[PDB]
C-alpha cells in the first residue's frame, strides 16, 4: 500500500497537473481496482478525496457527481462511506444530491434528507419536499443516534403540521419514546416535542390532554428554575384545566394544582382555579367582568380558533352550576332555575338535555311550565340500604363511644 499512497501522491501531482483531470481520472480508477484490499481503502480515501477535490476546483461537476455514481455503482463498503460523506457538501445541487441519496439507498442519506427536504423547498413546496421525510426515519431507528434521529422526527412533526395534516402527525408523533427523557441532553430538546403535542391537541379540540402536556413541560428543572419561564406555562395549565369538561382526571389534576405553592404567586388565575374547586353558583357576568381583561392580555385570542374558547368557558360554567344544584336541591322549578343559571327557559332545557344525553346528571322534567326534578329513582331496596347503612354506622358510635366513657373512669375516678 506504499505505492497506493506513493503513486497516489505521484498521481496527485499528475492529476493536479491535468486537474489544473477528466481524462486523468481513468488510469487512477483502474489502479484502485487492480488492488482490492487493505491498501484499497487507503486508495479509497486518497482517490475518493482527489476525485471530489477535482470537482471543487472548477466544478465542473455536472459529470463528476454522476461520474462518481457510475463509479460508485461499480462498488468496498467503507471506501464508499466517505466517498459519499465527502460529496454531501442550487439547481446543480438538486441532481447531485439526487445522485447521493440515489447511491446511498446509511447515516449519510438521512442527513442529506434533512438538507434536501427542508432546504429544497423551505416554502409552499413543503408538500413535495416533506413527502420524503414522511418516511425515511421509520426503520433507521437503531442506525441513527437519538439526537439527530429524534431531531428530524421533530422535523417530520412541524412539516406535517404546516402541511396541515393530523394522521401522520398522530402516528409519527406517538412513535416517540419518553424514556429517552432520562437524559438531560434530550430533555432540553423535548420542550419542542411537547410544544407540538400542544399545537396538535389544540387542533383536536382536546384540553385535558393539553393540560397534561403543559404539566409535563412545567415539570422541567430548566423551567422550574426560571420565574419568567414557568409563569406563562403555569397560567395555561390553569386555563385548560378550567376548559376541560368535568371528569375524573380533571379533579385530581385541579386539586393538585391548587396545592402547588407556586400557584400562590399568581393572583387572579389563583382566584379562577379556587373558583372552580369550591361548590357554589357561578353567575357568569361577574366572572367575565372580573377576569375578561386579565385573560385577554395574555399572548382566549381572536374570534376564530381562540375566540372559540369563549363558548366553551360558558359551557363549563353551565355544567358547573347545573353540576352543583344537583348536589343541594332535591327538587327544583323552572323560572327560578333559569334565574340561577341566568339563561332563560331555552338555554337551560338545552344544557340539561345535553348533560342527560351524554349523561352528567339524573334530572327528569316536568314540562308544563313547571319543574325540573333532580332526584334519582331509588326503590324500596335503595331506601333500605340507607337505613341498613345508618344502623351500622350508629353501632360504631355506640361502640366507639364506650372506650371514652371508660378511659375517663380510669383516668378520673
Amino acid at each position: 500500500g506504499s505505492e497506493r499512497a506513493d503513486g497516489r501522491i505521484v498521481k496527485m501531482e499528475v492529476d493536479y497537473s491535468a486537474t489544473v483531470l477528466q481524462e486523468v481520472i481513468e488510469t487512477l480508477l483502474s489502479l484502485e481496482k487492480q488492488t482490492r484490499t487493505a491498501s484499497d481503502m487507503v486508495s479509497t480515501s486518497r482517490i475518493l478525496v482527489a476525485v471530489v477535490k477535482m470537482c471543487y476546483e472548477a466544478k465542473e461537476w455536472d459529470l463528476l457527481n454522476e461520474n462518481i455514481m457510475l463509479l460508485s455503482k461499480r462498488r468496498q463498503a467503507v471506501a464508499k462511506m466517505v466517498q459519499q460523506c465527502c460529496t454531501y457538501v442550487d439547481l446543480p445541487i438538486k441532481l447531485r444530491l439526487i445522485d447521493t441519496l440515489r447511491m446511498v439507498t446509511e447515516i449519510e442519506r438521512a442527513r442529506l434528507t434533512k438538507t434536501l427536504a427542508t432546504i429544497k423547498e423551505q416554502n409552499g413546496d413543503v408538500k413535495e419536499a416533506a413527502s420524503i421525510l414522511q418516511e425515511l426515519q421509520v426503520e433507521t431507528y437503531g442506525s441513527m443516534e437519538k439526537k439527530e434521529r429524534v431531531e428530524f422526527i421533530l422535523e417530520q412533526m412541524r412539516l406535517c403540521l404546516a402541511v396541515k395534516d393530523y394522521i401522520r402527525t398522530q402516528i409519527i408523533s406517538k412513535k416517540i419514546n419518553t424514556k429517552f427523557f432520562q437524559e438531560e441532553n434530550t430533555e432540553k430538546l423535548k420542550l419542542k416535542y411537547y410544544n407540538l403535542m400542544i399545537q396538535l391537541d389544540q387542533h383536536e379540540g382536546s384540553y385535558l390532554s393539553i393540560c397534561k402536556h403543559y404539566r409535563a413541560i412545567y415539570d422541567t428543572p430548566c423551567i422550574q428554575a426560571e420565574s419568567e419561564k414557568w409563569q406563562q406555562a403555569l397560567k395555561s395549565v390553569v386555563l385548560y384545566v378550567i376548559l376541560a369538561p368535568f371528569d375524573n382526571e380533571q379533579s385530581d389534576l385541579v386539586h393538585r394544582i391548587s396545592g402547588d405553592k407556586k400557584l400562590e404567586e399568581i393572583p387572579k388565575y389563583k382566584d379562577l382555579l379556587k373558583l372552580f374547586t369550591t361548590m357554589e353558583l357561578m353567575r357568569w357576568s361577574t366572572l367575565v367582568e372580573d377576569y375578561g381583561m386579565e385573560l385577554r392580555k395574555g399572548s382566549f385570542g381572536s374570534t376564530e380558533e381562540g375566540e372559540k374558547r369563549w363558548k366553551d368557558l360558558k359551557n363549563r360554567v353551565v355544567e358547573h352550576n347545573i353540576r352543583i344544584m344537583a348536589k343541594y336541591y332535591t327538587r327544583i322549578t323552572m323560572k327560578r332555575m333559569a334565574q340561577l343559571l341566568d339563561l332563560s327557559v331555552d338555554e337551560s332545557e338545552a344544557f340539561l338535555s345535553n348533560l342527560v344525553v351524554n349523561k352528567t346528571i339524573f334530572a327528569k322534567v316536568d314540562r308544563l311550565a313547571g319543574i325540573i326534578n333532580f332526584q334519582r329513582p331509588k326503590d324500596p331496596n335503595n331506601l333500605l340500604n340507607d337505613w341498613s347503612q345508618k344502623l351500622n354506622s350508629l353501632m360504631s358510635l355506640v361502640n366507639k363511644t364506650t372506650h371514652l366513657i371508660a378511659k375517663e373512669e380510669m383516668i378520673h375516678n
Partner: protein
C-alpha cells in the same frame, strides 16, 4: 451468516422483515468436511452447542 449473525446482529434483521434462520443441514459424500464443521463452529462461536 445464518447461524452466528442472527444472534449478535439480528437486532436489525427485523429491519428487513425476516425471522432469523431456522436450521442448517450438511449433506455430502462421506468425507466432505461436515463433522469437522460442527467442531469448528462450537470452537469459535462458543455459547451452548
Amino acid at each position: 451468516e445464518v447461524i452466528e449473525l442472527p444472534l449478535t446482529n439480528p437486532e436489525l434483521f427485523q429491519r428487513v422483515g425476516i425471522i432469523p434462520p431456522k436450521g442448517c443441514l450438511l449433506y455430502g459424500p462421506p468425507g466432505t468436511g461436515k463433522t469437522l464443521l460442527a467442531r469448528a463452529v462450537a470452537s469459535q462461536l462458543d455459547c451452548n452447542f
